[PDB]
Amino acid sequence: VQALFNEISADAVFVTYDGQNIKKYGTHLDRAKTAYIPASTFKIANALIGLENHKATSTEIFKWDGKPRFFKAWDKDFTLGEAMQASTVPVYQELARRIGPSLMQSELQRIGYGNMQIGTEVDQFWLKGPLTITPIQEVKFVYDLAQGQLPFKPEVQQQVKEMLYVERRGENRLYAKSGWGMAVDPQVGWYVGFVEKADGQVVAFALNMQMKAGDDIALRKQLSLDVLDKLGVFHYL
Numbered sequence: 615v616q617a618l619f620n621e622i623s624a625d626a627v628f629v630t631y632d633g634q635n636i637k638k639y640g641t642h643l644d645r646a647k648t649a650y651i652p653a654s655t656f657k658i659a660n661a662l663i664g665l666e667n668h669k670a671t672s673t674e675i676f677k678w679d680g681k682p683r684f685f686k687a688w689d690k691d692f693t694l695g696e697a698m699q700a701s702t703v704p705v706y707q708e709l710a711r712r713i714g715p716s717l718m719q720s721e722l723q724r725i726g727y728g729n730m731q732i733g734t735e736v737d738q739f740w741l742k743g744p745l746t747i748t749p750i751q752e753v754k755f756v757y758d759l760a761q762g763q764l765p766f767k768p769e770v771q772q773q774v775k776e777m778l779y780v781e782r783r784g785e786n787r788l789y790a791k792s793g794w795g796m797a798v799d800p801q802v803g804w805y806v807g808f809v810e811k812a813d814g815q816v817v818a819f820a821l822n823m824q825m826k827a828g829d830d831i832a833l834r835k836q837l838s839l840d841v842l843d844k845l846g847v848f849h850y851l
């Protein structure tokens with residue numbers, strides 16, 4: 615497992631949380647206490663705040679306006695769950711604008727997300743600062759989501775949970791959200807979520823690593839599933 619991490623030149627940390635103990639793995643363990651921009655992983659909080667404050671529903675279709683977006687994959691209609699797995703930023707920037715800077719700021723402070731700072735721009739704060747979060751805060755945030763213990767309505771947490779559902783492996787279920795912050799130096803890579811194992815135990819996780827332009831998109835998820843197999847949390851099918 616240690617040999618897996620330094621097989622790359624990757625500066626990475628992998629955090630796990632079972633509700634009582636944080637475990638750290640990787641090449642750079644101090645990354646777990648270091649704050650980084652959430653990037654696309656903020657969509658979890660964005661979706662929670664939007665649904666809790668009745669600014670959107672999990673069945674609403676955010677239609678494309680016809681203007682080309684940063685990726686052509688984003689040039690289509692999305693629900694919030696579809697936009698979550700596609701990481702469709704323009705759909706969640708529209709959600710952030712429905713929420714507004716003052717409610718977004720008060721809600722992120724209410725739930726204690728990261729450093730609870732958003733600045734002035736309601737559709738940019740998670741992509742270039744000032745909002746930052748540590749990987750330990752990320753594992754605990756998504757672990758609380760898995761248990762329905764976040765300061766949100768129970769049906770709201772359930773809806774966002776199903777928005778993160780990415781794989782069923784027998785009676786085991788993987789929930790995850792990827793992130794790549796490219797508008798910061800250095801670039802940050804996230805892979806955050808939890809596994810609902812067949813025995814009933816929940817294990818949250820968060821990969822956090824340095825990234826650069828050449829990196830393959832699939833590397834973060836590959837690395838996380840690799841480690842999860844080695845940990846015994848999520849064995850390959």
Ligand SMILES: *C(=O)[C@@H]([C@@H]1N=C(C(=O)O)[C@@H](S[C@@H]2CN[C@H](C(=O)N(C)C)C2)[C@@H]1C)[C@@H](C)O
Nearest residue numbers: 653654655685687700701703792793794795
């Ligand atoms: C969020 O961190 C940024 C987005 N995160 C991405 C990522 O984690 O892959 C990409 S999404 C990109 C286009 N859709 C593809 C995809 O996820 N699938 C085909 C499943 C990859 C994007 C950089 C966002 C802030 O730009």
